[PDB]
Design an enzyme around this catalytic site. Structure first.
Site, PDB file in Angstrom:
ATOM      1  N   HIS A  69       0.586  -1.052   0.153  1.00 44.54           N
ATOM      2  CA  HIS A  69       0.434   0.035  -0.569  1.00 44.54           C
ATOM      3  C   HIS A  69       0.471   1.414  -0.329  1.00 44.54           C
ATOM      4  O   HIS A  69       0.781   2.167   1.124  1.00 44.54           O
ATOM      5  CB  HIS A  69      -0.713  -0.114   1.494  1.00 44.54           C
ATOM      6  CG  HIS A  69      -1.812  -1.102   1.228  1.00 44.54           C
ATOM      7  ND1 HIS A  69      -2.477  -2.486   2.091  1.00 44.54           N
ATOM      8  CD2 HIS A  69      -2.949  -0.743   0.278  1.00 44.54           C
ATOM      9  CE1 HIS A  69      -2.926  -2.642   1.172  1.00 44.54           C
ATOM     10  NE2 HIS A  69      -3.699  -1.977   0.864  1.00 44.54           N
ATOM     11  N   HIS A 107      -5.992   7.628  -3.592  1.00 43.52           N
ATOM     12  CA  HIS A 107      -7.123   5.702  -2.707  1.00 43.52           C
ATOM     13  C   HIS A 107      -6.872   5.445  -1.520  1.00 43.52           C
ATOM     14  O   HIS A 107      -7.187   5.374  -0.445  1.00 43.52           O
ATOM     15  CB  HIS A 107      -7.705   5.474  -3.571  1.00 43.52           C
ATOM     16  CG  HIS A 107      -7.327   4.292  -3.329  1.00 43.52           C
ATOM     17  ND1 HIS A 107      -6.176   4.179  -4.410  1.00 43.52           N
ATOM     18  CD2 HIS A 107      -6.981   2.801  -3.417  1.00 43.52           C
ATOM     19  CE1 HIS A 107      -5.749   3.133  -4.571  1.00 43.52           C
ATOM     20  NE2 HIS A 107      -6.159   2.404  -3.847  1.00 43.52           N
ATOM     21  N   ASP A 108      -5.075   5.883  -0.831  1.00 40.47           N
ATOM     22  CA  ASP A 108      -4.521   4.820  -0.357  1.00 40.47           C
ATOM     23  C   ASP A 108      -3.774   6.017   0.724  1.00 40.47           C
ATOM     24  O   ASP A 108      -2.524   5.268   1.401  1.00 40.47           O
ATOM     25  CB  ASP A 108      -4.001   3.659  -0.285  1.00 40.47           C
ATOM     26  CG  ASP A 108      -4.584   2.388  -0.308  1.00 40.47           C
ATOM     27  OD1 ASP A 108      -6.155   2.109   0.497  1.00 40.47           O
ATOM     28  OD2 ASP A 108      -4.515   1.640  -1.078  1.00 40.47           O
ATOM     29  N   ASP A 218      -8.352  -1.045  -8.229  1.00 42.79           N
ATOM     30  CA  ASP A 218      -7.390  -1.537  -6.965  1.00 42.79           C
ATOM     31  C   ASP A 218      -7.037  -2.676  -6.483  1.00 42.79           C
ATOM     32  O   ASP A 218      -6.737  -3.145  -5.756  1.00 42.79           O
ATOM     33  CB  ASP A 218      -9.125  -1.778  -5.411  1.00 42.79           C
ATOM     34  CG  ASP A 218      -8.466  -0.757  -4.348  1.00 42.79           C
ATOM     35  OD1 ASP A 218      -6.900  -0.796  -3.972  1.00 42.79           O
ATOM     36  OD2 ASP A 218      -9.028  -1.301  -3.391  1.00 42.79           O
TER      37      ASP A 218
HETATM   38  C1  LIG Z   1      -7.145 -13.687   0.232  1.00 44.72           C
HETATM   39  C2  LIG Z   1      -6.998 -12.475  -0.238  1.00 44.72           C
HETATM   40  N1  LIG Z   1      -5.998 -11.911  -1.302  1.00 44.72           N
HETATM   41  N2  LIG Z   1      -5.926 -11.114  -1.186  1.00 44.72           N
HETATM   42  C3  LIG Z   1      -5.791  -9.994  -1.846  1.00 44.72           C
HETATM   43  C4  LIG Z   1      -5.700 -10.152  -3.293  1.00 44.72           C
HETATM   44  C5  LIG Z   1      -5.363  -9.377  -4.789  1.00 44.72           C
HETATM   45  C6  LIG Z   1      -5.150  -8.161  -4.528  1.00 44.72           C
HETATM   46 CL1  LIG Z   1      -4.934  -7.095  -5.791  1.00 44.72          CL
HETATM   47  C7  LIG Z   1      -5.795  -7.731  -3.777  1.00 44.72           C
HETATM   48  C8  LIG Z   1      -5.773  -8.345  -2.467  1.00 44.72           C
HETATM   49  C9  LIG Z   1      -7.349 -10.366  -0.213  1.00 44.72           C
HETATM   50  S1  LIG Z   1      -7.948  -8.190   0.425  1.00 44.72           S
HETATM   51  C10 LIG Z   1      -8.923  -9.584   1.576  1.00 44.72           C
HETATM   52  C11 LIG Z   1      -9.511  -8.504   2.713  1.00 44.72           C
HETATM   53  O1  LIG Z   1      -9.115  -7.496   2.882  1.00 44.72           O
HETATM   54  N3  LIG Z   1      -9.967  -9.667   3.768  1.00 44.72           N
HETATM   55  C12 LIG Z   1     -10.649  -8.848   4.900  1.00 44.72           C
HETATM   56  C13 LIG Z   1     -10.429  -9.193   6.174  1.00 44.72           C
HETATM   57  C14 LIG Z   1      -8.844  -9.087   6.543  1.00 44.72           C
HETATM   58  C15 LIG Z   1      -8.682  -8.672   8.220  1.00 44.72           C
HETATM   59  C16 LIG Z   1      -9.672  -8.917   8.042  1.00 44.72           C
HETATM   60  O2  LIG Z   1     -11.052  -9.221   7.169  1.00 44.72           O
HETATM   61  C17 LIG Z   1      -8.203 -10.778   1.977  1.00 44.72           C
HETATM   62  C18 LIG Z   1      -7.427 -11.373   0.637  1.00 44.72           C
HETATM   63 MG   LIG Z   2      -7.112   0.874   0.364  1.00 50.59          MG
HETATM   64 ZN   LIG Z   3      -5.554  -0.249  -2.281  1.00 52.24          ZN
END
Ligand SMILES: Cc1nn(-c2ccc(Cl)cc2)c2sc(C(=O)NC[C@H]3CCCO3)cc12
Ligand SMILES: [Mg+2]
Ligand SMILES: [Zn+2]
Length: 314
Positions: A69, A107-108, A218
């Protein structure tokens, strides 16, 4: 200005137009790439060069040195938006084109490499200030702050009206980046689309669609060529695992996705994510905005690569 067209080397000049473009390892080229995109996407006229550069540089400043990020992500997210915008020329207002690229770059802002959940658990002041979409409210705040710095008002030529509108596009755009909010947004979008009630003339509807764009941009690392996708995932997990460590420090077992001891579970975890989030997102997006279809295709491609990882075919 103003006869001062930014240009890129040939290979970039061409490939920048494609969804799957990677912005590369040369940090110092990224501002230029953004400016290019803005000029192409918006006009050479939409912003005062000097102001815009100044804004860009301050935004950069305010992204931290976190594994994922970070500033690169910012610019990566902007570029996916640029591709969307450019493939859907006539669908977007002038105000929208302006605001959206900016939204994405911002955005971040000042992200710490930690989830909203962690902040809440830790009892961070930001959690008290902003009870939902914590970090996202923060990011918007930081955007406004920077806009308010001397000689950083890139919006200066806009009327009072137009200005309020643009800032409102940006606010909603950034808030949308809260993945917790994505699920319901998409469900509604899918229902509207299907019952044929979707109406781009209805602001409320537009909002939703912009939201989905946001999520799409995103998550765009899932829409890259496999080695990019694969390498970015490393970054993503570096943050997750650090957060995991911090959870353990607070005396909380983290979710396995954040547990570095459970590395082995990564591929399967990607599968779920692709299935639960990514694939539906790009699907509904393709429905609403057919020329975005390459994003869906690339995602599916990457899903398959993760399947292969599992089967030990790599
Ligand atoms: C598995 C996983 N892979 N990615 C991910 C993959 C590829 C991109 Cl390009 C961006 C993200 C994410 S984002 C997420 C999430 O935010 N979970 C929410 C949970 C966490 C903390 C508590 O609630 C869970 C995952
Ligand atoms: Mg963000
Ligand atoms: Zn982002």
């Amino acid at each position: 200005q103003g006869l001062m067209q930014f240009t890129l080397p040939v290979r970039l000049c061409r490939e920048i137009e494609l969804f799957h473009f990677d912005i590369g390892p040369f940090e110092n080229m990224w501002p230029g790439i953004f400016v290019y995109m803005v000029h192409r996407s918006c006009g050479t006229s939409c912003f005062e060069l000097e102001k815009l550069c100044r804004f860009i540089m301050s935004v950069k400043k305010n992204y931290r040195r976190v594994p994922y990020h970070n500033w690169k992500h910012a610019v990566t997210v902007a570029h996916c938006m640029y591709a969307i915008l450019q493939n859907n020329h006539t669908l977007f207002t002038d105000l929208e084109r302006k605001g959206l690229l900016i939204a994405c770059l911002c955005h971040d802002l000042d992200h710490r490499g930690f989830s909203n959940s962690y902040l809440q658990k830790f009892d961070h002041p930001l959690a008290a200030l902003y009870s939902t979409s914590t970090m996202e409210q923060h990011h918007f705040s930081q955007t406004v702050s920077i806009l308010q710095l001397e000689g950083h008002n890139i919006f200066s030529t806009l009327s009072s009206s137009e200005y309020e509108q643009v800032l409102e596009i940006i606010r909603k755009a950034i808030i949308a980046t809260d993945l917790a909010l994505y699920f319901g947004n998409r469900k509604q979008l899918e229902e509207m689309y299907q019952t044929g009630s979707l109406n781009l003339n209805n602001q409320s509807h537009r909002d939703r669609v912009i939201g989905l764009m946001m999520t799409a941009c995103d998550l765009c690392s899932v829409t890259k060529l496999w080695p990019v996708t694969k390498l970015t995932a490393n970054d993503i997990y570096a943050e997750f695992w650090a957060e995991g460590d911090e959870m353990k420090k607070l005396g909380i077992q983290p979710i396995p996705m954040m547990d570095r001891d459970k590395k082995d579970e990564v591929p399967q975890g990607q599968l779920g994510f692709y299935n639960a989030v990514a694939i539906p997102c790009y699907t509904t997006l393709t429905q609403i905005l057919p020329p975005t279809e390459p994003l869906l295709k690339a995602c599916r491609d990457n899903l398959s690569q993760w399947e292969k990882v599992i089967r030990g075919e790599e």
